[PDB]
């Protein structure tokens, strides 16, 4: 059934699973035409497919060429997402295929179910959680590879850097969600915090700064304040 507050720890057991987020697959800019009408221009997007136990991120770049000549693009985007996820599963050896795929939006359920009819043993699940994966394009290196792509491409990341060397997957997932919740609520502040230290470095092979344990506490604390804060500035509390 649905993934929610009450079965949260299942993500970190030893059953392979993936989250699929489709919020950044079909991205547009809205602009005015010479005649004073409105039109859209597509820009490159990505599918965010994440193993929450390992932090492996299969970032499928959706190049704007895939929309050429197509109608009903918001609907196609969900099927295109489902098609790329089921291609990914088919490319993996059986023992690496997920036992569950959890979609962050319910509108992906039918598209993925249909593309996965060949895999009746993979449970396709929604969730009641308001996960902040849409903010993945606020991570500079992710945003950069998506915008630079000139063709369809799959890029692999570990969204946890080397954190699992020191913390558990439960705690790494929780840091990830805080960072992204922060980025979603106030990207400028969020980034000011992370890059607040002129002496700190993000490794070439990483997405986030190389914080010490103690520095992560400070950072995580500052990201909590931000999320509470913007909650005031937005609600006047």
């Amino acid at each position: 059934g649905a993934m929610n507050s009450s079965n949260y720890a299942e993500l970190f057991n030893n059953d392979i699973k993936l989250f699929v987020d489709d919020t950044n697959v079909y991205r547009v800019t809205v602009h005015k035409t010479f005649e004073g009408n409105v039109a859209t221009k597509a820009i490159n997007g990505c599918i965010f497919t994440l193993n929450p136990k390992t932090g492996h991120l299969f970032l499928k770049i959706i190049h704007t060429s895939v929309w050429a000549g197509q109608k009903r693009l918001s609907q196609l985007a969900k099927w295109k997402t489902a098609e790329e996820v089921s291609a990914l599963v088919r490319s993996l050896p059986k023992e690496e295929q997920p036992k569950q795929i959890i979609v962050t939006r319910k509108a992906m359920l039918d598209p993925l179910e249909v593309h996965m009819l060949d895999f009746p043993n993979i449970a396709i699940r929604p969730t009641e959680l308001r996960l902040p994966f849409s903010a993945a394009m606020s991570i500079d290196k992710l945003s950069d590879v998506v915008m630079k792509a000139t063709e369809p491409q799959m890029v692999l990341f570990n969204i946890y850097d080397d954190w699992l060397d020191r913390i558990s997957s439960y705690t790494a997932f929780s840091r990830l969600t805080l960072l992204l919740r922060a980025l979603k609520t106030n990207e400028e502040s969020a980034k000011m915090i992370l890059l607040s230290d002129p002496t700190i470095t993000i490794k070439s092979y990483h997405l986030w700064p190389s914080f010490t344990d103690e520095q992560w506490i400070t950072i995580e604390s500052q990201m909590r304040d931000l999320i509470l804060t913007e909650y005031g500035r937005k609600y006047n509390v």
């Binding site: 196609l76 099927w79 489902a82 098609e83 039918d110 598209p111 179910e113 249909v114 593309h115 009819l117 060949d118």
Partner: protein, 300 residues
């Protein structure tokens, strides 16, 4: 005109014959039903006074044999049987008819309701859905489950309707996932029509038979089959014009006949609103939409 004589009526029962019905009191002098129109299937059904639970009945065609009803006090129901001795049947029937102990199938001569509800229903096909090949008539009741329901327990007592499943490999061609799910024409026209049913008449016949088992017996599994076969057509962008026109007539008379106070349970909101207002065929069911909107506008 044919006759379904009754040996007697030992328990109080409500008897249904096609869309008609009447009450018989315990040990009332009653020896069955006469003047039944030849050329159509018929259904004679039962609801005991003491247990409105379980409505059961028999689908039959009088052209296929001489049939009668006798209550069985061991199994506790009115059972259909075949009299193979034709002369004896005639002597027995003629005797009940002269003593005026039979009710008359009460067909108004303007009325084509029963024809319209059974136009494509054929006893040979019913007997493939209801497997019991040693009888020429077919028993159905409220509790019988469908082959698809058993996939989701006694196979011999099941309703072997054609399995429709919109999220199945049968329904979905590899590489046409989105196409085949949003426009089921391939599944309707090639898989089901050309492949399984062979023609639209057999399709409509199963559809009409499912509805009638729903209406007369509250056989949930039939209700599900009926809606599924409607929805498969409505969700197909490409349907022969003749099938659409015939479908409109078929459903019009089903909705016209449905007991008003059963529409809440039977009629599936999602399927009808989709079929009438969102689907490819939203503009092709004028008669059905007009009767639905004037009779059950709550549901929409």
């Amino acid at each position: 005109m044919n006759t379904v004589p009754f040996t007697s009526a030992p328990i109080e029962v409500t008897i249904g014959i096609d869309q008609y019905s009447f009450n018989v009191k315990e040990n009332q002098p009653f020896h069955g039903i006469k003047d039944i129109p030849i050329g159509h299937v018929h259904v004679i059904h039962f609801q005991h006074a003491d247990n409105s639970s379980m409505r059961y009945g028999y689908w039959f065609d009088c052209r296929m044999g001489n049939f009668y009803i006798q209550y069985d006090p061991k199994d506790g129901l009115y059972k259909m049987m075949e009299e193979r001795d034709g002369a004896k049947f005639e002597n027995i029937v003629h005797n009940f008819k002269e003593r005026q102990m039979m009710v008359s199938y009460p067909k108004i001569d303007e009325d084509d309701t029963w024809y319209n509800l059974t136009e494509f229903v054929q006893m040979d096909k019913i007997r493939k859905i209801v497997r019991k090949d040693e009888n020429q008539f077919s028993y159905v009741d409220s509790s019988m489950t469908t082959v698809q329901e058993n996939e989701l327990s006694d196979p011999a007592h099941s309703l072997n309707y054609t399995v429709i499943n919109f999220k199945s490999r049968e329904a979905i061609r590899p590489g046409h996932e989105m196409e085949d799910f949003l426009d089921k024409s391939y599944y309707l026209n090639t898989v089901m029509l050309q492949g399984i049913f062979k023609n639209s008449s057999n399709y409509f016949g199963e559809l009409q038979f499912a509805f009638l088992n729903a209406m007369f017996f509250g056989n949930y599994g039939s209700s599900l089959q009926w809606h599924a076969m409607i929805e498969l057509i409505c969700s197909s962008a490409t349907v022969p014009k003749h099938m659409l026109d015939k479908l409109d007539e078929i459903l019009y008379y089903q909705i016209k006949t449905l007991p008003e106070q059963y529409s809440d349970i039977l009629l599936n909101e999602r399927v009808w609103n989709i079929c009438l207002y969102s689907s490819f065929q939203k503009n092709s069911l004028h008669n059905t939409e007009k009767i639905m909107e004037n009779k059950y506008p709550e549901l929409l």
